[PDB]
């Protein structure tokens, strides 16, 4: 898998008495001063590649007919196989920096507890849980716009409980219309008085909304934000709004309008993770994610056949917590249904187990090449609810770079919809008509999915965030990079490809209850039960 020679590209690309183009020979040129740079970076290596690989497409291109073309297509493959070898052969310790990241409101002490497990066992890691000490009423305005909706969706409902079929369809549907007023009515007031006062404070501006419009108690607010402001600050947390030069001026507005505009913590949280690794390096991780555990605490523990990979690894878990008790509360339900001799088992390999780095897996040393950000998977896809990046590695950079280019044709399609619309249903029609009349064989799968970006969060199965700020960007990025693109939005890449870049699978356990609770944000006709059953089971 060494990339073949200059002399080699002309036995391959050889066409007997062929002249000699201007193109080709760039084409080689350039190949054999790749061969002459082994001092040079990673990085800069992978740039003499990607310039080779638009010169050869550039030669493609001026002669479609040519008789070096199914070589040439061949030597493309090489170059895409020579990013893996640069990869592979660049491998250097992470900054020992671990990330978590908790904005919008209190942090629990489910979240508490994760972590915890984390810092216990990473003493040589330094421990950030990211806040925005500017930010912790976001949940609480989400909670009440979504309140109010909710409950006048429900006055319009009021004598239909039974019949035709007002079901939970028409309920989200005709509450999001009202959802949508609300928020646009927040997002108005909140953007006159940034135009008015950009010292202003996010918060406060929430509880002065709060107040005259829910009236919400100041009082209780400012209690409330003084209460998130100490447990986050007792508990390692890391202010965004201290940290100088992380901000790339266009993603601090992404994240922003995630925060601010549209509530949606998840997307804000992509945003801020992939910079805050780019500024910083390390590991990132959501704060449902547990350690590792040790390969060799429960390797003579055989699974009883008719159990699955997956429960077994939560099983596993269950163990630990029912005998050490580390995260109080966390569940039994799987573990307690084997045979009680697997239980037992179970106790005895925890027995002769001292400390918590016997029981988990420290991450110590993880290496990871300037050129890639490794990615958790779950289900044969990328999930980034786990991340390692070097400081200013490159992928970093193609992940931001598509972050950027994704939410520029929202935004640019998107603002000059809501702007002209006298509610939701117009808005949508005008921004999905928007979105058609640029899409492509490329970018329409892409367009397809961030149709809904105005239901994230108050709809079930909206797909816009991952194509903006999650696993797509992601894949995304690993295609520029093996392909040396700068625009990838329709993926070709398959999961073993992929692979290459997949988180290391011994140093995180990502089958825990607070996950496993998490993939159940299907479908909830029960909701519109739940809201349907709050009139009729009080005062
Ligand atoms: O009030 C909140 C809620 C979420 N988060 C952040 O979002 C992360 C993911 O939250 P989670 O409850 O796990 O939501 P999911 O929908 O299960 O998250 C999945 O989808 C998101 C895509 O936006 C990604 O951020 C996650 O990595 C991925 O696991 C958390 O760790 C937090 O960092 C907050 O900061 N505040
Ligand atoms: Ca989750």
């Known amino acids: 898998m060494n990339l073949v020679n200059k002399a080699q590209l002309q036995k391959m690309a050889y066409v007997k008495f062929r002249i000699q183009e201007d193109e080709y020979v760039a084409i080689l040129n350039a190949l054999e001063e790749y061969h002459n740079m082994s001092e040079s970076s990673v990085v800069e290596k992978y740039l003499k590649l990607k310039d080779i690989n638009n010169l050869t497409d550039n030669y493609l291109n001026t002669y479609k007919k040519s008789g070096r073309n199914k070589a040439l297509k061949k030597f493309k493959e090489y170059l895409t196989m020579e990013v893996l070898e640069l990869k592979n052969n660049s491998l250097t310790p992470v900054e020992k920096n671990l990330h978590f990241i908790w904005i919008g409101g209190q942090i629990n002490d489910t979240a508490i507890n994760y972590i915890n497990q984390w810092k216990d066992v990473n003493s040589d890691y330094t421990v950030k849980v990211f806040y925005d000490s500017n930010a912790f009423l976001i949940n609480t305005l989400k909670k009440t716009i979504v309140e109010s909706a909710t409950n006048n969706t429900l006055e319009s409902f009021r004598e239909n409980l039974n019949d035709p079929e007002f079901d939970y369809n028409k309920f989200y549907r005709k509450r999001m219309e009202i959802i949508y007023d609300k928020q646009k009515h927040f997002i108005d007031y909140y953007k006159s008085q940034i135009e008015e006062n950009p010292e202003f404070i996010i918060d406060n501006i929430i509880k002065t909304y709060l107040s005259n419009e829910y009236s919400k108690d100041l009082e209780a607010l400012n209690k409330y934000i003084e209460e998130s402001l100490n447990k986050i600050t007792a ?14 001026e266009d993603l601090v507005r992404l994240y922003n309008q995630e925060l601010v505009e549209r509530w949606n913590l998840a997307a804000a949280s992509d945003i801020l993770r992939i910079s805050m690794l780019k500024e910083d390096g390390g590991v990132y991780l959501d704060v449902d994610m547990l350690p590792g555990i040790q390969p060799d605490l429960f390797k003579s523990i055989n699974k009883p056949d008719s159990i699955t990979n997956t429960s077994w690894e939560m099983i ?6 029912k005998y050490k008790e580390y995260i109080p509360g966390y569940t039994s339900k799987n573990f307690d249904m084997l045979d009680e001799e697997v239980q037992r088992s179970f106790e005895s390999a925890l027995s002769s187990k001292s400390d918590k780095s016997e029981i988990f897996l420290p991450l110590d040393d993880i290496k990871v090449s300037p050129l890639e950000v490794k990615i ?29 280019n994704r939410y520029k044709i929202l935004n640019d399609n998107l603002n ?6 006298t509610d939701f249903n117009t808005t949508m029609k005008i921004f999905s008509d ?4 640029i899409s492509n064989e490329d970018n329409m799968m892409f367009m397809i999915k961030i149709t809904n970006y105005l239901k994230v969060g108050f709809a079930p199965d909206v797909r816009s965030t991952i194509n903006l700020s999650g696993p797509g960007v992601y894949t995304g990025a690993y295609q520029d990079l093996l392909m040396f693109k700068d625009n990838s939005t329709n993926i070709h890449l398959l999961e073993p490809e992929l692979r290459n870049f997949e988180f290391p699978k011994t140093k995180i356990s990502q089958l825990t209850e607070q996950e496993i609770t998490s993939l159940w944000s299907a479908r909830a006709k029960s909701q519109f039960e739940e809201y349907k059953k709050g009139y009729f089971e009080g005062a």
Not at 316 to 321: G, N, Y
Not at 376 to 404: E, G, M, P, R
Not at 416 to 421: F, H, Q, T, V
């Open 316 to 321: 596993k878990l269950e163990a630990i917590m």
């Open 434 to 437: 928007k979105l058609a009349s």
């Open 416 to 421: 000059p919809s809501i702007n002209e619309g």
């Open 376 to 404: 958790a998977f779950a289900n044969n896809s990328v999930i980034n609810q786990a991340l390692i990046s070097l400081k200013d590695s490159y992928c970093s950079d193609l992940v931001i770079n598509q972050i950027k």
């Open 235 to 248: 508990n390692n947390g890391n202010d965004i709004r201290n940290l100088e030069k992380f901000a790339d």
